[PDB]
TrEMBL record, chains A, B:
The lineage of its organism: Bacteria, Pseudomonadati, Pseudomonadota, Betaproteobacteria, Burkholderiales. InterPro entries: HTH_MarR-typ, MarR/SlyA-like, WH-like_DNA-bd_sf, WH_DNA-bd_sf. This is Transcriptional regulator, MarR family. It holds the Pfam family MarR. Residues 4-130 form the HTH marR-type domain. Signal peptide: none annotated. The keyword Ubl conjugation does not apply. The keyword DNA-binding applies. GO terms for biological process: response to stress. (indol-3-yl)acetate binds at S19, H23, R37. One of its GO terms (molecular function) is DNA binding.
Length: 134, 134
């Protein structure tokens, strides 16, 4: 069957299944998917452009702008003059424990594969992103 | 930065970027993303359940049911008595050339990585899907 070994289908299924597991945890901790992606993407980061944030969070830029309107109103992020965006201390403290849980979940996902295969997967994915980003 | 090496973020970005490239081709050939996923998933397949189709096409089941209503009206798929679904000859002929283009695009995406790394990636993704599917 074509779909059994078609790379874009494999990537999309693996991504949806693993992400859906963690999204249940995020919601139980009071986060929507989009708020989790924004805060996790900005944590530990220098300010980045709205367009960079949209790419890394895999969210359309007009959707990101609406999201930032409300997250900035809640004091979790700040836009700065191309517009840059950063997480605030309030946002970092809000997301820090969830980030620890995300690392634990990722470790569980990767444990059956071993360190070599896990690092090879992450390296390949990073190289693909850097080759295909606009 | 957390997000630079967080597996779910890497999978989702790689998946979106590679898929968006092929989706431009699909649209230029008159297909929506959802129609392409359904026909490509059913091509060469025995009939599968609606729930299986929803998982492999990464589409919510109520969305799939609406999609199948219109694709069946156009004679591209058929539902059969758990409901099973298959592609028809009309659907297969409609999607065959696009599938060839999809294989060519996939070959281009994977060529910089070489056969060993490409097969390792596909194997890891398949194993992850089979471990995380419900
Ligand atoms: O939601 C997911 O699991 C996928 C994803 C895409 N971009 C992200 C940025 C930060 C954290 C997770 C994600
Ligand atoms: O649209 C994409 O490229 C991802 C995708 C997810 N499930 C699919 C089934 C068949 C073809 C492509 C896909």
């Amino acid at each position: 069957r074509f779909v059994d070994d078609y790379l874009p289908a494999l990537l999309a299924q693996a991504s949806q299944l693993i992400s859906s597991e963690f999204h249940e945890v995020a919601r139980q901790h009071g986060f929507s998917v989009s708020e989790w992606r924004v805060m996790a993407s900005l944590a530990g980061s220098e300010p980045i452009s709205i367009g960079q944030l949209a790419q890394v969070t895999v969210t359309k830029q007009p959707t990101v702008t609406r999201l930032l309107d409300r997250m900035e109103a809640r004091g979790q992020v700040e836009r700065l003059p191309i517009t840059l965006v950063r997480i605030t201390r309030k946002g970092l403290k809000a997301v820090e424990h969830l980030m620890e849980l995300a690392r634990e979940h990722e470790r569980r996902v990767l444990e059956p594969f071993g360190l070599r295969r896990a690092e090879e997967l992450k390296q390949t994915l990073r190289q693909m992103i850097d080759l295909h980003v606009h």
